[PDB]
């Protein structure tokens, strides 16, 4: 029960977590639960969560915690020794489950991590979406991200080739990748992730966090539709079975 006490006050580091809004509600991103399970496994094995490759499988998302506007929240993590069956829950309602482990070199399977050249520039503007439009689509669906989670700099019309801005926080990067995945499946219904199949994170191959003056790092990312696998930098998300939701009008009745 390696309890984690997140805080969302003004001066706390996790203020950025309030940027992950879904229809006018500050939902705690599933990427947050994944990172928390990652840290729990790292701690339980006497490792640091910045140099431990990890693989989360059979992951399923049950509920979405509503982050307080200002205050602190508590979320517990309970992993088993052998099977690594984690259980990220808060209070009395379970948030996410699945298995978490630490494999060897055989962790990433996409090869986009090795790639370092972008090549997305010098493409006609008619064939590249900027950040503004890429996130206009998602806000149209219903996900209204703040500046800290707007971690996509450019995308292709095919929605396959894209550029991510790595700036230290892991949750922002993972939600950027998941945003790529959501963008891969067009529509008009507020898609909600429920079940994953494999999320492999390899921090070693990932570029180091920028310093304060080194601005950001531009990381290439690709979405392979054959297996439906989204890989950017050092992460690799796969599966992403989803359900629909009935939206929630943010304003007063028209």
């Amino acid at each position: 029960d390696s309890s984690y006490s997140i805080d969302v006050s003004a001066d706390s580091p996790d203020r950025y977590l309030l940027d992950h809004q879904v229809d006018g509600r500050e939902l705690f991103p599933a990427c947050g639960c994944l990172v928390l399970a990652w840290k729990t496994l790292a701690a339980l094995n006497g490792r640091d969560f910045e140099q431990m490759p990890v693989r989360l499988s059979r992951v399923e998302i049950h509920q979405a915690m509503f982050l307080p506007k200002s205050g602190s929240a508590t979320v517990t993590v309970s992993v088993m020794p052998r099977t690594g069956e984690f259980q990220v829950c808060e209070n009395e309602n379970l948030l996410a489950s699945g298995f978490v482990t630490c494999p060897d070199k055989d962790v990433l399977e996409t090869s986009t991590h090795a790639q370092t050249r972008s090549s997305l520039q010098d493409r006609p503007a008619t064939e590249v979406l900027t950040r503004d439009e890429v996130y206009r689509e998602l806000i149209l669906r219903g996900y209204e991200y703040g500046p800290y989670f707007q971690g996509i700099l450019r995308a292709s019309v095919d929605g396959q080739e894209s550029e991510i801005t790595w700036d230290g926080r892991w949750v922002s990067f993972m939600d950027s990748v998941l945003q790529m995945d959501i963008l891969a499946r067009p529509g008009d219904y507020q898609m909600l992730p429920i079940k994953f199949q494999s999320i492999n994170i390899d921090p070693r191959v990932q570029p180091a966090a920028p310093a304060e003056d080194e601005d950001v790092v531009v990381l290439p990312g690709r979405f392979d539709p054959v297996l439906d696998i989204v890989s950017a930098g050092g992460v690799e998300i796969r599966g992403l079975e989803t359900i629909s939701a009935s939206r929630r009008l943010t304003h007063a009745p028209e």
Binding site: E127, V128, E133, E137, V157
Partner: peptide, 13 residues
């Protein structure tokens, strides 16, 4: 006509 990429993506969809 078509100027940006969002228009092209919408047309394709």
């Amino acid at each position: 006509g078509i100027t940006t990429g969002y228009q092209t993506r919408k047309i394709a969809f």
